[PDB]
Every structure is written in C-alpha cells, then in structure tokens.
Amino acid sequence: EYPTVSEIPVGEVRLYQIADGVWSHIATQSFDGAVYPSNGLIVRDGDELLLIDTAWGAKNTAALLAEIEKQIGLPVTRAVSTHFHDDRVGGVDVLRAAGVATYASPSTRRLAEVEGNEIPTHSLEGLSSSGDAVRFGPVELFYPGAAHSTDNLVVYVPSASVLYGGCAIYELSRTSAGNVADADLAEWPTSIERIQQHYPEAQFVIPGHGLPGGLDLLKHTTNVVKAHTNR
Amino acid sequence: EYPTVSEIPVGEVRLYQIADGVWSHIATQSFDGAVYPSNGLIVRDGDELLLIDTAWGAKNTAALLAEIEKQIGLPVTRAVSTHFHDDRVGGVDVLRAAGVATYASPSTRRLAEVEGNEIPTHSLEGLSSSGDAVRFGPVELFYPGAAHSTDNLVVYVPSASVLYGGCAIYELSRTSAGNVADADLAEWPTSIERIQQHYPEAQFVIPGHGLPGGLDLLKHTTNVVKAHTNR
Ligand SMILES: O=C(CSc1n[nH]c(-c2ccccc2C(=O)O)n1)Nc1nc2ccccc2[nH]1
Ligand SMILES: O=C(CSc1n[nH]c(-c2ccccc2C(=O)O)n1)Nc1nc2ccccc2[nH]1
Ligand SMILES: [Cl-]
Ligand SMILES: [Cl-]
Ligand SMILES: [Cl-]
Ligand SMILES: [Cl-]
Ligand SMILES: [Mg+2]
Ligand SMILES: [Mg+2]
Ligand code: NA
Ligand code: NA
Ligand code: NA
Ligand code: NA
Ligand SMILES: [Zn+2]
Ligand SMILES: [Zn+2]
Ligand SMILES: [Zn+2]
Ligand SMILES: [Zn+2]
C-alpha cells in the first residue's frame, strides 16, 4: 500500500495519508547509478499545512507543492527541515518563492551554509541540547542528539501518534549503513534511546527513506549502526 | 535510448541491440532500500545464442529467457558467468533446467561454492593468470587480474568491437565505489590497464551496471577506484 520507487518516476511526488490530517510525501532521486526514495511529512494545522522537509530538490519540491495543491487544496504556510542535507533543504528556495515560511535550527542553518546548501530563513530556538523539545503548531520538535547528522531533528504528531524519524531512523529493508559521512556513530544509539524514552507511545514510525513501521524501527536502526561501527 | 531502472519494473528484463547479433540484457533488483540495474550480454553464434551472465536471480533469469524466446527466437545454448556473485550466477539453476550449458572459470566456480552461490557446471580452462585470453565461440574471454573480484572476467566481441567489462568497469554516473567487499583495490587499476592494452580498438564498453559508453569508462573506473583507495 505504501508507494515504492516503482510507482514514482523520478520527478514525481506521491502523498500517503497516515491519519486524519497527516500525510507523508514520497519522492525519488537518482545518483551514483541507483534510485532512492525519500519521505517527508505533511500535518494539517487548522486551515493550513505544516510541511516537514523538502522533496529532495527544486523540481521535486515544485511537484510536491503542485501535488499538495490539487490533492489537499490547503496552503502550506510553514516548513521545517530536519537536517542540513539536500534531501531535507534542497527545494527550500522553491518553498520560499511560493510564500512558505521555512524554518530550521541554528545548527542546521549553520551547517547548510558551510555546505553551500539552501538555508531555511527562520531559526528554531530551544533545540541546541540533546533531549530538547519544543512545540511547533500541531507537532513537537525533538533534538535527540547527534546521529545521522549532528543537527538531526525528529518530529512527533501527538494527535495521531506519528513519529517522523527522518534520516536518524532506517527502514527495515536497509540492513547496511546509509550515508554516514556526517554521522556520529558513537552517539547514534544513545540518541535513538532518547527518542524511545520520549515517545514510547508512538504507533507509526516514518523513516527518512522507505517503508514506515512501528517503534521496532528504532531497535532496527541501532542494530544496523552497531554492526557498521564494528565493520 | 538505453533503458534505465525507470522503464524496468523489478522482475522484468529488457533487451538492447548494440550491433548485428549483439545485445545487452538489462534487469533490476531491490537491495537495501534502493533499486539497481544490471547488464549482461547476448551474442549470436550462427543459429544459437551465447549468454553472458544471468539477470540477477531466478525470477529475472526466467524472464530473461522468455524475453529472448519472444524477441530473438534463437536457442541459448551456452552461458558464461563473469564472476561468482549473485548478479552473475544467480539464475544459473534456471538456465541449467532450460538446457543451457553454464560455464565459469575454476576460480569462479571455487568462489561460488565457498559463498554458497549457484555454481556453473562447466569449467573454462586457460584463464588463471592475469592477461590470459581464450576464444569462446563468437567472443574472447579475458582475465585482466583481480579488480571488482579476484576472478572477474571481461568479454570482447571482435566482430562488433564490443567490450563487456562486467563489474570491473563502472558507468560514468557512478562516482563512488560500489560493492568492494571482495575487491582487490591495490590491483584494480593495473587490471584495467591490461584491458586497455589488450582491447584498444574497442568502440562500445558495457559496464556491469548502468549506461554503456566508450573506453573512457576504463579511465573513469580508475579515477573512482583511486579516490576510494584514498578515502
Ligand atoms: O547527498 C545528499 C544529502 S546527504 C544524505 N542524507 N540522507 C541520504 C540518503 C540518501 C539515500 C538513501 C539513504 C540516505 C540516508 O542515509 O539518509 N543522503 N543529497 C544529494 N547529493 C546529490 C548529488 C547528485 C545528485 C543528487 C544529489 N542529492
Ligand atoms: O552481494 C551481492 C552480490 S555482490 C555484487 N556484485 N556487483 C554488485 C553491484 C550491485 C549494484 C550496483 C553495483 C554493483 C557493483 O559494484 O558491481 N554487487 N548481492 C546482494 N547482497 C545483499 C545483501 C543484503 C540484501 C540484498 C543483497 N544482495
Ligand atoms: Cl549502480
Ligand atoms: Cl547522543
Ligand atoms: Cl534507501
Ligand atoms: Cl592486477
Ligand atoms: Mg552504477
Ligand atoms: Mg532505505
Ligand atoms: Na545512470
Ligand atoms: Na500551522
Ligand atoms: Na555459440
Ligand atoms: Na571520454
Ligand atoms: Zn542526510
Ligand atoms: Zn536522508
Ligand atoms: Zn560482484
Ligand atoms: Zn555487479
């Protein structure tokens, strides 16, 4: 039922309704001779939408906004990027040009600038220390500590018990580490345990790439990170 | 013009005619949350066909044979696997059940057995030393030395100037190393130079995965291997 790369040509975006007023958005990107999917989140906040992460690039993100406009028909007023990599901020300029207020932590904004990536305009304060949580409309933003990146955030939708782990959480089908160039392998398991301890009631867990599941995805990611550590 | 993973659902196989009586076969496989393509070769020999490498698995290889039967309509009498990994021998049992004589070097047969992979039935003698070449019907088989694997073979079709590099040769779009668990990074550039020196007249170069090109694919692979070596 969840869309895979098969049903998504490169450049198209699919939406998947997880619960009342909660969708994921799925896009694909081709690099290094393979094709990868990527997830973000959409959360209804009254008569508007909060977007979590771009669709991995300007063209994808323009298709994302067109797909939201036709399938949901509510305005995207704010967006949050969960870390500084292109699958999360690639397309921020498209969002800004459409009138979306783009947000990220100062850590993410700093790292995006150093990398030469697109930089969300607004700063999310209160997330600099591991275990920090802040409310952002219909979601909670949580900094679990360094993992996939030193800045990665996770997002929880309390009304639907949906946990969006971003790239700090792997799908079950991924049994080897992904891009860990910017990761903190030493701290990643501890950061996942902070997620587990803060959101033990989560019923739906969305990885940054691939199929959703339950809280088992946290233990799965810990297994994979530790195996990579011991390579 | 060359098929990519977009036009190939996982489980289907496409044929691409390179020249008179020379085709590549293209399949896809899901692996670790991504989709990868894979190439093999088909070379007409009189009224029969020589197959280079499986389509990466039993289902793909059954689809490969059905696609050959309907699009070319000539019998596959012999097959050669160019190294011992599953994208080259996965499906050998299907070929054997269909009456195809399967071949590999004793080095490949030895390594496949150790790995628990399918084992081609017939042995290709005369390929144990770097630089060894043997004729096999309408092609020449060449052992350039260890590279992607210690056993990898390349195949040249002299009548069409087609060089099938297998997984020792990367497509241009791949700028980072692939699966190098069984590779000899120290010897891979020297092995590529042997290919260059033996087939300087090659006009079309087929990598194990992705888009074909010219002999520049050899220098490209050297560039990528050396960069990975210096990681
Ligand atoms: O490299 C980046 C951001 S780094 C990153 N974060 N997450 C991942 C990632 C990707 C696939 C599967 C798993 C993961 C993961 O482990 O999360 N990669 N973007 C980028 N570079 C490009 C170069 C050329 C063309 C397009 C490009 N798009
Ligand atoms: O390990 C193998 C065969 S080794 C091999 N040879 N060539 C390649 C290859 C594949 C794609 C792109 C480039 C290359 C390359 O670099 O040539 N891979 N298959 C395998 N392992 C798995 C482990 C877990 C789940 C599924 C798995 N499927
Ligand atoms: Cl590839
Ligand atoms: Cl931590
Ligand atoms: Cl992936
Ligand atoms: Cl060598
Ligand atoms: Mg490739
Ligand atoms: Mg994945
Ligand atoms: Na490509
Ligand atoms: Na809102
Ligand atoms: Na023949
Ligand atoms: Na060139
Ligand atoms: Zn990332
Ligand atoms: Zn990612
Ligand atoms: Zn291989
Ligand atoms: Zn391969």
Numbering used by the authors:
A (entry chain B), B (entry chain A): 30 to 45, 47 to 64, 66 to 100, 102 to 107, 109 to 131, 133 to 150, 165 to 205, 209 to 211, ...
Authors' description from the paper:
A main mechanism for bacteria to develop resistance to β-lactams is the expression of β-lactamase, which hydrolyze the β-lactam ring and renders the antibiotics ineffective. VIM-2, a B1 subclass MβL, was initially discovered in P. aeruginosa, which showed a high prelevance and broad substrate spectrum, including penicillins, cephalosporins, and carbapenems, it therefore reflects a significant drug target for the treatment of antibiotic-resistant bacterial infection. As is typical for B1 MβLs, there are two Zn(II) ions in the active sites of the enzyme.
However, only the crystal structure of VIM-2 in complex with 1b (VIM-2:1b) was obtained successfully through co-crystallization. The protein active site structure, including Zn–ligand and the distances between the two Zn ions (3.9 Å) agreed with the publications. The crystallographic analysis revealed that 1b replaced the hydroxide which bridges the two Zn(II) ions and bound to the Zn(II) ions via N atoms on the triazole ring; the carboxyl moiety of 1b interacted with Zn2 and formed an H-bond with the backbone N atom of Asn233 and the water molecule W2. In our crystal structure, residues Trp87 kept a native pose, yet the binding of 1b to the active sites of VIM-2 resulted in a conformational change of the residue Phe61 on the L3 loop and formed a potential clash with Phe61 utilizing the benzimidazole group. Moreover, two Cl− and four Na+ ions have been observed. IC50 values of 1a–j against VIM-2 were measured in 30 mM Tris, pH 7.6, in which the concentrations of inhibitors were varied between 0 and 120 µM. The IC50 data listed in Table 1 indicated that the 2-triazolylthioactamides 1a–j inhibited VIM-2 with an IC50 value in the range 20.6–58.6 μM, and 1h was the most potent inhibitor (IC50 = 20.6 μM).
